[PDB]
Structure 1
Amino acid sequence: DEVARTDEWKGAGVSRLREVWDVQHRVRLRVLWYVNSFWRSRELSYDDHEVELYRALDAYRARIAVEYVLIRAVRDEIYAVLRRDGGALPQRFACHVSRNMSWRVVWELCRHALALWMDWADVRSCIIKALTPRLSRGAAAAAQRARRQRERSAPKPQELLFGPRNEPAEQTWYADVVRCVRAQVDLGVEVRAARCPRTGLWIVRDRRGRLRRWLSQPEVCVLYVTPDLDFYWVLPGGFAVSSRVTLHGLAQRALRDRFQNFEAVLARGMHVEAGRQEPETPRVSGRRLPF
């Protein structure tokens, strides 16, 4: 009888159940240990010197710290350009203002909101979420093509009179809303934005088109980031300070290890055609009989 490995696998049973935690002690998942695995019959050696654990903890520290050192770089850039201009900032966002108004207290509230936002930074925030489309698959040719289409010459009448017809006035902006009447900070916020054609400033609405109405509230402050990594930090009254976010003091494979945007493969219920309207999810559920 050439008896199968499956029956001796089951009848050999499982030795013991051992649970384990993660490093941050957030999840706690359990591990089985079957005796009839081939894990036993390879005769593995095992050892852990402490210097390797120290280097492992340092590498894991870097992997956790890449986001917060990016946020610290953002704060340093804010303070750098705020020292650089000399304290005089323009209004880059459309809001009607009054002249007789106390403005030193708005500066105090702006410093307060800046310290509060630095206290409550997280990996689920503006710059990380705006960075995730930049790490994608077709980002290189898309940015190259947008650069070439931006840097195209003035068209001659030949391509206007016989060539093909020519051709994104709104942008997908990401926002961190902080607020000091309640010390409530709001992290993952999406804002549709474009220019006001009557002037040269920006108009910020919802995806529904709400005309986002926190800018008139005197206590909030917002951080805006654009997909081309342009930077904005807007105190009430429409005045704001601008920069570029600088990530050049950071490694590349750390940025791809941490929050590189995901690419999916084909499972059941998915179109082998690329990009049609898919049907519903597979949805293996316990409410129904599982069929």
Structure 2
Amino acid sequence: METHLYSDLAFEARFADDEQLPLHLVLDQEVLSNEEAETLRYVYYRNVDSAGRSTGRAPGGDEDDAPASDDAEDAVGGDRAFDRERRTWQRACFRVLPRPLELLDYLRQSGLTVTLEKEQRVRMFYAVFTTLGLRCPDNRLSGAQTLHLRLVWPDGSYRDWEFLARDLLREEMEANDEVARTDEWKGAGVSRLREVWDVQHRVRLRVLWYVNSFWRSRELSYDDHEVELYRALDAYRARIAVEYVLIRAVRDEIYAVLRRDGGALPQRFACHVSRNMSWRVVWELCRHALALWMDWADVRSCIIKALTPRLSRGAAAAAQRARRQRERSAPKPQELLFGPRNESGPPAEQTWYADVVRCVRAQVDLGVEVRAARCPRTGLWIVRDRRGRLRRWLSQPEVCVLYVTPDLDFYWVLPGGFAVSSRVTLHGLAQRALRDRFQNFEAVLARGMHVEAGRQEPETPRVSGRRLPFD
């Protein structure tokens, strides 16, 4: 309850500078699980307009509108593009109520008065109360605007939903001694409770409306044109298409390399092979596997998980250091004798991600981590299980694999270790599209974490529904 009140006052004190109106939300088991509710660290929200443009960026356009680079030296913009993305998200206050409750009884047991149009109870295993701001860029609010909600957890993992302002305001705008603001806020109470879905109808959350909000006083205008909603839908379409266009880029690359080579696949992975085998049925199984990979590829494909560490801020500088290191001049005798010893080069083992596609019972594994190293005798690759065990799927006739190396080289491997090899091309995606869709979250400091970086943080914060809360 107090988070809504404080956030209302906070958005009022900031309204002239920001023009963000305070939207009060409640989340339950329809949007997040109990562990995610108890261990939630941050909530972040983003405003994008009827043209797909975030309100943290330049109002007319950005240098991120140019296509990506494919260079590790550039890393799709480097630190500046990362900073332009981080500036686009804004942080929201939130409180978790981790034990089962019924919402209206909770509000009445607090100071509030509730006078809903129909007294329908809603019951919820846990509740997260948070306030997001949707930006009326003037005293005018459009229905084609969408708002993004981000929930983040201590390991840095995040979950994004997005819903457009028309869903939120479908009803609310379509109808449009001395006292303390706290007492009249409680006395005036709540009279609305509306259920809103995100655009893709994945998650439901409830919006809570108060009659004491400064929202009521402003008498600003709202509108939804058809063409604006059409353009907003097109921008949304471009948003969600970003991983699938990369998947199709890899698919077209595989077919293009296969046409270029003439179907001759050289061995790149170690596996003892026999001549006296029906290699043609292996080619047929390769066809079925390459169809099935397109059937089941997803956002959690190896290609997205390979590009994601490239978008991190350190990536460009580290790539330039590596470029300098590999092309360093051979040391003179003086340096070897008197000077410092040379930097150790890249470790013999690399970390990769793979998509393992088995045909016999159609199944595709996507976010698979493997360790790769070249065996000394022949420079082929040995792919090992991240517990150090040799991966056996090279020996199974009914499985093909697509690996993507950390430098965005991809292999597509058949039984026997004969592979198609090429590079993932990012040029079909604007730098902003990739960069905003897949940039990793970087944490701001909070309760229970070291001021110094790199420290082993102590017991992570939690709000417990199973235990009597400590103070």
Q: Which category describes the TM-score, using the shorter chain as reference length?
A: over 0.9
Structure 1: runs of 5 or more not aligned = none
Distance 1:201 1:162 in 2: 38
4+ residue stretches of structure 1 with deviation over 4 A?
none
Deviation at 1:166, TM superposition (A): 1.7
Deviation at 1:230, TM superposition (A): 0.7
Distance 2:415 2:342 in 1: 39
- Superposed CA deviations along residues 233-282 of structure 1, whole A, max 9, x for unmatched, are 00110100100000112101111111111111111110101101111210
Distance 2:223 2:336 in 1: 73
- Superposed CA deviations along residues 61-92 of structure 1, whole A, max 9, x for unmatched, are 00000110110011001000100011111000
Does residue 4 of structure 1 match 2:180?
Answer: yes
Q: CA RMSD in A?
A: 0.8
Distance 2:448 2:390 in 1: 39
1:101 match: secondary structure: coil
- Superposed CA deviations along residues 5-55 of structure 1, whole A, max 9, x for unmatched, are 000000001011111101110100000000000000011100010000000
Distance 1:119 1:141 in 2: 37
Distance 1:101 1:154 in 2: 48
Distance 1:162 1:123 in 2: 52
Q: Which residue of structure 2 lines up, in the alignment, with residue 37 of structure 1? A: 213
1:80 match: secondary structure: helix
Moved more, 154-163 or 216-225: 154-163
Distance 1:74 1:279 in 2: 42
Alignment partner of 1:219 out of 376, 395, 398: 398
Distance 1:86 1:181 in 2: 27
Taking every aligned residue pair, what percent have the same amino acid on both sides? 100
Structure 2: runs of 5 or more not aligned = 1-176
Distance 2:194 2:465 in 1: 27
Deviation at 1:157, TM superposition (A): 1.0
1:187 match: secondary structure: strand
Alignment partner of 2:233 out of 51, 57, 65: 57
Deviation at 1:283, TM superposition (A): 1.1
2:390 match: secondary structure: coil
- Superposed CA deviations along residues 196-215 of structure 1, whole A, max 9, x for unmatched, are 01111000111210111111
Give the paired residue count: 291
Deviation at 1:165, TM superposition (A): 1.4
Distance 1:61 1:41 in 2: 36
- Superposed CA deviations along residues 173-196 of structure 1, whole A, max 9, x for unmatched, are 000000011101111100001110
1:255 match: secondary structure: helix
Distance 1:249 1:23 in 2: 25
1:89 match: secondary structure: coil
1:204 match: secondary structure: strand
Deviation at 1:57, TM superposition (A): 0.3
Does residue 175 of structure 1 match 2:354?
Answer: yes
Distance 2:458 2:391 in 1: 34
Distance 1:241 1:155 in 2: 37
Q: Which residue of structure 2 lines up, in the alignment, with residue 81 of structure 1? A: 257
Alignment partner of 2:363 out of 184, 192, 202: 184
Deviation at 1:159, TM superposition (A): 1.4
Distance 2:391 2:446 in 1: 39
